[PDB]
Amino acid sequence: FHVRVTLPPRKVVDRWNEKRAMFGVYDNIGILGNFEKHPKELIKGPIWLRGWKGNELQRCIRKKRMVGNRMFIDDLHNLNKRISYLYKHFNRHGKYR
Amino acid sequence: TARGTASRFLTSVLHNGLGRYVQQLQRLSFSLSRDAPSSRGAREFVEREVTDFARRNPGVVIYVNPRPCCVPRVVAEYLNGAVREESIHCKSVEEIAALVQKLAD
Amino acid sequence: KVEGDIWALQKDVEDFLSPLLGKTPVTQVNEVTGTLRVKGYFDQQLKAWLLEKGF
Amino acid sequence: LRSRVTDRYWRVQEVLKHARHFRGRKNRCYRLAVRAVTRAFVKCTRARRLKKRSLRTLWINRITAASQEHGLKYPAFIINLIKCQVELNRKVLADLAIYEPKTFKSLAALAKRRREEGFAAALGDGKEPDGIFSRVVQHR
Amino acid sequence: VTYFSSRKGKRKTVKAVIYRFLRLHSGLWLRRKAGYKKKLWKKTAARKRRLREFVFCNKTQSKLLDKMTTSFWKRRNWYADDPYQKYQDRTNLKV
Amino acid sequence: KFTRSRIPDKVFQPSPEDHEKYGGDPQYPHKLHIVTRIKSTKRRPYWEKDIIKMLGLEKAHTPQVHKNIPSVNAKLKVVKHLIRIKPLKLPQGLPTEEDMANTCLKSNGELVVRWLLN
Amino acid sequence: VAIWQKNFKRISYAKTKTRAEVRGGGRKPWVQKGSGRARHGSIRSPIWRGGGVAHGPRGPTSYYYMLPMKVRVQGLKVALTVKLAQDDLHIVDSLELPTADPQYLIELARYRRWGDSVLLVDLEHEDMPQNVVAATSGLKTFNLVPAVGLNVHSMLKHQTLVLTLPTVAFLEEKLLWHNSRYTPLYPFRLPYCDFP
Amino acid sequence: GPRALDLLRALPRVSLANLKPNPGSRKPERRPRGRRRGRKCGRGHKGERQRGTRPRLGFEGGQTPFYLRIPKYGFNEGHSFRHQYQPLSLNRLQYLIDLGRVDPTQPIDLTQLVNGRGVTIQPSKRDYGVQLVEEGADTFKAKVNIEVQMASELAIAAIEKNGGVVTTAFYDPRSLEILCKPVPFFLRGQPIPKRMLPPEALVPYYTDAKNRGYLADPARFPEARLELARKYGYVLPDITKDELFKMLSTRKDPRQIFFGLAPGWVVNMADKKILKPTDENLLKYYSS
RNA sequence: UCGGAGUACAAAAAACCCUCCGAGUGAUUUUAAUCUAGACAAACCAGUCAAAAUAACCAUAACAUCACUUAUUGAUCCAAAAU
RNA sequence: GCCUAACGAGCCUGGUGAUAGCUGGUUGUCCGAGAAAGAAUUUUAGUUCAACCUUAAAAAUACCCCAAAAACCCUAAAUUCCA
RNA sequence: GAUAGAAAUUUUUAUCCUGACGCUAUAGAGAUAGUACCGUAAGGGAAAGAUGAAAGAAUAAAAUAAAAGUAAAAAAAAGCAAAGAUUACCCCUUCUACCUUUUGCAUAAUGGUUUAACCAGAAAAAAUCUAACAAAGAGAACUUUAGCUAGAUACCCCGAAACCAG
Ligand SMILES: [Mg+2]
Ligand SMILES: [Mg+2]
Ligand SMILES: [Mg+2]
Ligand SMILES: [Mg+2]
Ligand SMILES: [Mg+2]
Ligand SMILES: [Mg+2]
Ligand SMILES: [Mg+2]
Ligand SMILES: [Mg+2]
Ligand SMILES: [Mg+2]
Ligand SMILES: [Mg+2]
Ligand SMILES: [Mg+2]
Ligand SMILES: [Mg+2]
Ligand SMILES: [Mg+2]
Ligand SMILES: [Mg+2]
Ligand SMILES: [Mg+2]
Ligand SMILES: [Mg+2]
Ligand SMILES: [Mg+2]
Ligand SMILES: [Mg+2]
Ligand SMILES: [Mg+2]
Ligand SMILES: [Mg+2]
Ligand SMILES: [Mg+2]
Ligand SMILES: [Mg+2]
Ligand SMILES: [Mg+2]
Ligand SMILES: [Mg+2]
Ligand SMILES: [Mg+2]
Ligand SMILES: [Mg+2]
Ligand SMILES: [Mg+2]
Ligand SMILES: [Mg+2]
Ligand SMILES: [Mg+2]
Ligand SMILES: [Mg+2]
Ligand SMILES: [Mg+2]
Ligand SMILES: [Mg+2]
Ligand SMILES: [Mg+2]
Ligand SMILES: [Mg+2]
Ligand SMILES: [Mg+2]
Ligand SMILES: [Mg+2]
Ligand SMILES: [Mg+2]
Ligand SMILES: [Mg+2]
Ligand SMILES: [Mg+2]
Ligand SMILES: [Mg+2]
Ligand SMILES: [Mg+2]
Ligand SMILES: [Mg+2]
Ligand SMILES: [Mg+2]
């Protein structure tokens, strides 16, 4: 349970750095922008996850449908197994039925 | 627990209340932040109450320090030499007032 | 959509509904939402009464 | 986002400070110590209720010593003190017995007198006599 | 019941329900009586009538059937010529 | 089976000596009961538990007052082994509205109207 | 709305391996009975040292949701209202600046007591005067943003809001449009009778 | 207006630092830690359920399940193929006209109802269109030219009395979809398709003047129409002598989806131009 | 598996590898309809009664009867029948 | 029997996070209420219904209950029902 | 039955702004390494690092001395080892370890020498709560006889003998 004996270097975060100052800027792009682009377009991320959401099973299932043929063998195999597991678990296990 | 801790007999300091009564609390020191929210109550207390408190108790010297702290404390100090530390951190004006009274008596 | 002193409106609504039930109607005022909420279905009679006052 | 408990140290001290004065490994090892400390608190509160009984029994033993000195058994002394409308709890009575032997011999004299008065009235078989100390006063 | 399907990740319906029950929009379920086509010669005409009925299911059964059945089946239906359109709203219910 | 129990009316026909004994007047029945719950409802059947609850007798060694009408006497008869019943007495009579604050109830079962003058 | 702006963008890439994805341990490390010790399957079980993580984070995860239109609009209205009611909103004409020295801007905000941070809203991105752009490109606290980039978060981050006059005339119309509008038949980016 | 605003002068800035979700908005979740929510953690003790394995939903523990002992009966039988007509009461029609959503001046068909959001069609659910129902019959004062896919005697009667005209038209599913949301179709870049005919079951409906069917022989119209008066006891107005009459007489071809456009044209909405085929084969196909 | 008596003394319910009798149908002609208020019974499924109203028949005509009458019985699906 | 120290059928890897109605385990504090079994079931080491119970919500009567009242041979403690 | 499950037909606007409410040596890759070592072989498969600007500053200079384990310092009638206490360590008095499992455990029923670090509740159909707008609501596809939309509230860990393919 030994706790560190030396004060860490105090980390100074300036909140006025560029990324923090400009945060959330174009979020209203739809409303103020005479709707053309939905805020989804702003989302930088994995291809299957842009502007979408879901529980781990749905997530995996979707990843496989979209990028499943660009995947590495090991990773595709792992994904299939994860899907099968999650399927069995969600459908057949739990308290609530 | 009682076997666990120390103990003492009932006493007064300097036979107080025999000849005359002497308020034993000597000085009171507050430390708070003008800015920080944690000290909010303690600030209000300093605004309204401290003044009046100081009249109600002529014998105690009250030192108020605004300084950049995250945890406002009040240090009671007694004729006995005894020093008692307290944290007024994140309390009402009401709570602090009651606390300062306990310290006074 | 109640803009104003909502307490006024509560007074008038319970003074309006009281002769109907024999007793003051139970109410909830949401001052921040600008909303009044009444126990029971008075919907018709209240639209009538708010029409009469010209809102 | 991994979160580990950093302060575990203090978590342990709040148990271990209560365990310092124990004998054996109970005073070091958190497992053993925890169980021992809990047992100590439980035993403690139960004893907080017990203490009052113990003290009252002490007082009764002392009052009995004190009375027996004067040739008066305990029950007689106590109830015949009640029948004089003298209500002194046993705490105070024991302290008189120790620190005020005179006043206590007086109390004992009173009780003995009141008792004899009682026997006198029960054997007498009449309503007329009221012993001086057998009179019952009402509040004013 | 499949709570999350494999392809769609949605929740499947148990078709075995949809063949024997009927959901009014009020939430009442309607069912045939059991054994109503069975051994008719052997039965009283009174009993036969009691069997030819369409009857309502208790709350428990209803909730069970609702769970076993997706959202699509609870939608408001307007059918032309429908016998049961008369019965889909509830009236004068003080509870 | 252990069940509820009938109590034959003969039990409640008082003998002429009983009046002398318990201090009741042969001619006039008393108006009010002071009932106290002397025993515990535990280890007794649920119905006695209920009767005790609806007599206001929940707390032990606390007095409660009840009409001497038959409606009440019935329930009291059910639980009579759990309680102590003593007639309320009024030496100074019933309290007026000036006497409400000064009222007290003495253990002989009597209600004194003026308590502690000056 | 502030919470929304913060979260809806977020994608957590935090992944842990389940006892399935860890490197080895397809085999029972000793026999079920007689060895005298605890029974185990794979040495990669979540109990074991190097083993898989019992629950832990899974996959890139998206937190994404949409607050209904009228709510985000209302949010913007309210932010504006509150900036005004607390005296921290300043309607400016122009935006023409006498010079490109940012020190001028800082000291200007000192003379009018504008607080530490300032949000300067302009009507369009190309039409911004060059003196402003120069001055404000080298400043941390003073931030220049076009109208379509107005938002709740940025308004609560900066102590003071500065709105151009045509910008006001823009916002007023854009936000007000929603009190009187039908629910969308199809997306508003398509042809509508009255609507652009 | 909002006196709340005046309390905001007195209080500190609204910032990101002080923000409270409305009380009650978030019911805090609870985790199986500690003395209360730990130690069997709401799962009970042993058995099938503490282990998470209890059987599927309908399963009754081996006795023949309730939902399977009840006999099959056609209830939902063929449900997908039943026609569905979204009801529109005269009360709603009147209420829409009164508030200036649909205007009675020009002819009212499905697209007009949809654009006022007086009604919502979803063809995918096998909605075949709007039907007209009589709820507001007595109260109905408007003068309209209306085209619906079904109507009741009473509804028609209530429209005639006011000097309007009702006609029942048919749209097939594709036609219908195109009709209800026209602008999404015009971005599709396809010609305007032929309106299909009704199927064999629905022919005796649209061929009758009783229903004022769009395929009905107009010779019977003024006859049957007058009949409806004798029954409900009102004087039938002469629609001919009215000033709005040229609009009231307006029909569609039984093969046409819209008013004034024609099967086989193409709407280029960026140029605001229409395009029509000059070819003979195309013109024979689309005009048949 | 179903029913009757005792257990289970007087509303109901009530167990046993408890005590005793039974049922897995005959015989007969009075061939015993439709629809519906309200109930009994009941975990569910199943079981029970039943007024008014229709239609059948004397021209204001609806309980099949007997054998202790109580029990003489079997869900879905699926198969054969065609109503 | 023997097939690389365990062969009623080798070993290793993969299927695999096999599946266990069976055992074990399940991590802060304090407060509010709070449960012993009728029914089916390859079911009695389990489920799913009742009855209880918990959290909200609408109501109006809820227990307690004197006469009167509930069987034919004999039959108790007592039930049922109710102002 | 468990379950499985389409299509017709629909929708999808460029390129730059790439990083992190991911890990920090029992974590994150198995990885300092597929190495050592173990298997005849297929195969399995580790552990381990910490001075400073300079050690071409080792009569060497600098900030924790806090786990269990020991030493400094063996023990002194009597008892789940403590608690009430007490001038006083004991002596007196009062208490049948803890988990689990059970109708019921001081039980002579289960588990643990001890310390550190790791090691186990996950889902939004209906519901409730909060809010928007409301005969309509939803940023398309749907739902609506006060509804619709959004948010918040939920359902573990380790273990067989087996079975199949190579
Ligand atoms: Mg006490
Ligand atoms: Mg593996
Ligand atoms: Mg294997
Ligand atoms: Mg062993
Ligand atoms: Mg295994
Ligand atoms: Mg790992
Ligand atoms: Mg618990
Ligand atoms: Mg525990
Ligand atoms: Mg367990
Ligand atoms: Mg069990
Ligand atoms: Mg619809
Ligand atoms: Mg009943
Ligand atoms: Mg009849
Ligand atoms: Mg071998
Ligand atoms: Mg398992
Ligand atoms: Mg079992
Ligand atoms: Mg065991
Ligand atoms: Mg209990
Ligand atoms: Mg079976
Ligand atoms: Mg239940
Ligand atoms: Mg009676
Ligand atoms: Mg009653
Ligand atoms: Mg099956
Ligand atoms: Mg490592
Ligand atoms: Mg490793
Ligand atoms: Mg140590
Ligand atoms: Mg001892
Ligand atoms: Mg046992
Ligand atoms: Mg148990
Ligand atoms: Mg014991
Ligand atoms: Mg033993
Ligand atoms: Mg032993
Ligand atoms: Mg044992
Ligand atoms: Mg053993
Ligand atoms: Mg043991
Ligand atoms: Mg065992
Ligand atoms: Mg154990
Ligand atoms: Mg052991
Ligand atoms: Mg939901
Ligand atoms: Mg949870
Ligand atoms: Mg829960
Ligand atoms: Mg097999
Ligand atoms: Mg098998």
Contacts of residue F51, defined as CB under 8 A and 6 or more positions apart, other chains included, come to F75, F78, F79
Q: Has residue H129 been placed in a domain? A: yes
Token pair recorded at residue H275: 């395009």
For A93, which residue in chain E has the nearest alpha carbon? Answer: E3
How far does the CA of residue E9 sit from the closest CA of chain A (Å)?
5
For E73, which residue in chain H has the nearest alpha carbon? Answer: H76
For D30, which residue in chain A has the nearest alpha carbon? Answer: A1
Could you check: is the Cβ of residue E38 within 7 Å of any atom of nucleic acid strand I? yes
Q: Please give the Cα distance from H3 to A97 (Å, whole number).
A: 52
- Rounded to a whole number of angstroms, the CA Rg of chain D reads 28
Strands H127-133 and F104-106: unpaired
Could you check: is the Cβ of residue E58 within 7 Å of any atom of nucleic acid strand I? yes
Q: Which residues have CB atoms below 5 A from the ion given as ligand 25?
A: G 50
Taking the C1' atom of every nucleotide in all shown strands and the CA of G33, the nearest one is: K160
Q: Which residues have CB atoms below 5 A from the ion given as ligand 5?
A: G 41
The residue that minimises its CA distance to C1' of I33 is E45
Q: Which domain holds residue D82?
A: 1-140
DSSP F101: T
Q: Of D110, D50, D53, D56, whose CA–CA distance to D85 is shortest?
A: D110
D-B interface (Cβ pairs under 8 Å ≥ 3): yes
Using CB atoms within 10 Å of the CB of residue A2, give its burial: 0 to 12 exposed, 13 to 18 middle, 19+ buried: exposed
* Chains touching F, CB cut-off 8 Å, 3+ pairs: none
Q: Please give the Cα distance from D107 to D66 (Å, whole number).
A: 11
The runs of H, that is alpha helices, within chain A are: 18-21, 56-67, 73-92
Taking the C1' atom of every nucleotide in all shown strands and the CA of H68, the nearest one is: I76
**Residues G59, A60 contacting (CB under 8 angstroms):** yes
Q: How many CA atoms lie within 13 A of G188 on its CB side?
A: 19
Q: Of F78, A94, B53, G23, whose CA–CA distance to H50 is shortest?
A: A94
For residue G186, give the nearest of H5, H8, H183 by CB distance.
Answer: H183
Sign of CA pseudo-dihedral G53, A65, A38, G120: positive
Token pair recorded at residue H251: 């029909």
Q: What angle do CA H17, H21, H25 make, to 5 degrees?
A: 165
Sign of CA pseudo-dihedral H278, H282, H284, H288: negative
Q: Please give the Cα distance from B103 to B21 (Å, whole number).
A: 16
Q: Which residues have CB atoms below 5 A from the ion given as ligand 10?
A: H 46-47
User: Are G66 and A39 a contacting pair at CB < 8 A?
Assistant: yes
Q: What is the 3-state secondary structure (H, E, C) of chain H?
A: CCCHHHHHHHCCCCCCCCCCCCCCCCCCCCCCCHHHHCCCCCCCCCCCCCCCCCCCCCCCCCCCCHHHHCCCCCCCCCHHHCCEEEEEEHHHHHHHHHCCCCCCCCCECHHHHHHCCCCCCCHHHCEEEEEEECCCCCCCCCCCEEEECEECHHHHHHHHCCCCEEEECCCCHHHHHHHHCHHHHHCCCCCCCCCCCCCCCCHHHHCCCCCCECCCCHHHHHHHHHHHHHHHCCCCCCCCCCCCHHHHCCCCCCCCCCCCCCCCCEEECCCCEEECCCCHHHHHHHCC
| Helices (H) then strands (E): counts for chain F | 3, 5
The runs of H, that is alpha helices, within G140-185 are: 152-157, 165-176
Tell me, in angstroms, the distance from the centre of ligand 5 to residue G26's CA. Answer: 9
- Resolution for this experimental structure (Å): 3.2
Sign of CA pseudo-dihedral H276, H277, H278, H280: negative
Report how many domains make up chain H.
1
Q: Please give the Cα distance from C44 to G63 (Å, whole number).
A: 44
Q: Of E7, G18, G27, whose CA–CA distance to A78 is shortest?
A: G18
Q: Which residues have CB atoms below 5 A from the ion given as ligand 7?
A: H 39
How far does the CA of residue A20 sit from the closest CA of chain D (Å)?
21
Residues of chain G with Cβ-Cβ distance to A80 below 8 Å are none
Residues of B contacting chain D (CB within 8 angstroms): 1-4
Report how many domains make up chain D.
1
**Residues G72, A31 contacting (CB under 8 angstroms):** yes
DSSP G25: -
CA separation, residue H209 to residues H142, H151, H214 (Å) = 23, 12, 8
A-H interface (Cβ pairs under 8 Å ≥ 3): yes
User: Are G156 and H8 a contacting pair at CB < 8 A?
Assistant: no
Q: Which of H13, H18, H269 to mutate to test the interface with G (most CBs of G within 10 A)?
A: H13
Distance between the two ends of chain C, CA-based, in angstroms?
11
From the CA of E42, how many Å to the C1' of I63?
A: 18
Residues of chain H with Cβ-Cβ distance to C3 below 8 Å are 1-2
Q: Please give the Cα distance from D96 to D88 (Å, whole number).
A: 10
User: Are G60 and A28 a contacting pair at CB < 8 A?
Assistant: no
CA separation, residue A71 to residues A75, A79, E8, G13 (Å) = 6, 10, 21, 18
Residue reference for tokens 């200007």: G108
For H59, which residue in chain A has the nearest alpha carbon? Answer: A97
Token pair recorded at residue F86: 């003593």
User: Are G191 and H183 a contacting pair at CB < 8 A?
Assistant: yes
Report how many domains make up chain F.
1
CA separation, residue H51 to residues E4, F7, H44, H47, H54 (Å) = 21, 56, 9, 7, 8
Angle at which helices A56-67 and A73-92 cross, to 10°: 150
Q: Which of chain I's bases lie under 7 Å from a protein CB? A: 32-36, 43-50, 64, 73-78
Instruction: At C2, give phi and psi (nearest 5°).
Output: -110, 110
Q: Please give the Cα distance from B36 to B13 (Å, whole number).
A: 39
**Residues G95, G142 contacting (CB under 8 angstroms):** no
Q: Please give the Cα distance from D86 to D67 (Å, whole number).
A: 16
**Residues B72, B87 contacting (CB under 8 angstroms):** yes
Give residues 102 to 161 of G whose Cβ lies within 8 Å of H. Answer: 153, 156-157, 159
Residue reference for tokens 């607050």: G67
Give residues 42 to 71 of D whose Cβ lies within 8 Å of B. Answer: 44
Could you check: is the Cβ of residue H63 within 7 Å of any atom of nucleic acid strand I? yes
Tell me, in angstroms, the distance from the centre of ligand 31 to residue D25's CA. Answer: 29
Q: Which of H3, H6, H8, H179 to mutate to test the interface with G (most CBs of G within 10 A)?
A: H8
Q: Please give the Cα distance from G122 to G20 (Å, whole number).
A: 55
Hey, what's the torsion of the CAs at H213, H216, H219, H220, to 10 degrees?
Answer: -60
Instruction: At G31, give phi and psi (nearest 5°).
Output: -75, 150
Q: How many CA atoms lie within 13 A of F85 on its CB side?
A: 18
**Residues H109, H248 contacting (CB under 8 angstroms):** no
CA separation, residue G114 to residues C48, G106, G117, H266 (Å) = 51, 10, 8, 59
* Chains touching C, CB cut-off 8 Å, 3+ pairs: H
Residues of chain G with Cβ-Cβ distance to A59 below 8 Å are 58-59, 61
Could you check: is the Cβ of residue E59 within 7 Å of any atom of nucleic acid strand I? no
Query: How many A×D Cβ pairs under 8 Å?
Result: 7
**Residues H113, H119 contacting (CB under 8 angstroms):** yes
Q: Has residue H55 been placed in a domain? A: no
Q: Please give the Cα distance from H226 to H231 (Å, whole number).
A: 9
For A97, which residue in chain H has the nearest alpha carbon? Answer: H57
Gaps in chain D (C to N distance exceeding 2.5 A) after: none
Q: Please give the Cα distance from G138 to G103 (Å, whole number).
A: 10
Host H or E run for residue D57: helix D30-69
Residues of chain D with Cβ-Cβ distance to G14 below 8 Å are 1
User: Are H49 and A95 a contacting pair at CB < 8 A?
Assistant: yes
Residue reference for tokens 């404390």: B73
Residues of chain C with Cβ-Cβ distance to H3 below 8 Å are 5
Q: Please, what are the domains in chain G?
A: 1-196 (3.40.1370.10)
Q: Which domain holds residue F44?
A: 1-118
Q: What angle do CA H16, H20, H26 make, to 5 degrees?
A: 130
Using CB atoms within 10 Å of the CB of residue E37, give its burial: 0 to 12 exposed, 13 to 18 middle, 19+ buried: exposed
Contacts of residue H5, defined as CB under 8 A and 6 or more positions apart, other chains included, come to G81, G85
Tell me, in angstroms, the distance from the centre of ligand 34 to residue B4's CA. Answer: 40
**Residues H261, H185 contacting (CB under 8 angstroms):** no
Q: Please give the Cα distance from H255 to H285 (Å, whole number).
A: 11
**Residues H227, H200 contacting (CB under 8 angstroms):** no
The residue that minimises its CA distance to C1' of K144 is E76
Q: Specify the 3-state DSSP secondary structure of F89.
A: strand
Tell me, in angstroms, the distance from the centre of ligand 16 to residue H62's CA. Answer: 12
Q: How many CA atoms lie within 13 A of C21 on its CB side?
A: 16
Strands G89-92 and G160-164: parallel
Domain B1-105 has CATH 3.40.30.10: yes
DSSP G72: H
Token pair recorded at residue H247: 């609009």
How far does the CA of residue H103 sit from the closest CA of chain A (Å)?
28
Q: Of D95, D19, D21, D26, whose CA–CA distance to D55 is shortest?
A: D95
Tell me, in angstroms, the distance from the centre of ligand 13 to residue E46's CA. Answer: 14
Residues of chain D with Cβ-Cβ distance to A3 below 8 Å are 6-7, 9
**Residues H84, H127 contacting (CB under 8 angstroms):** yes
Instruction: At B52, give phi and psi (nearest 5°).
Output: -55, -45
Taking the C1' atom of every nucleotide in all shown strands and the CA of E60, the nearest one is: J49
From the CA of G70, how many Å to the C1' of K14?
A: 30
Q: What is the largest CA-CA distance in chain F?
A: 62
From the CA of H66, how many Å to the C1' of I21?
A: 37
**Residues A27, A39 contacting (CB under 8 angstroms):** yes
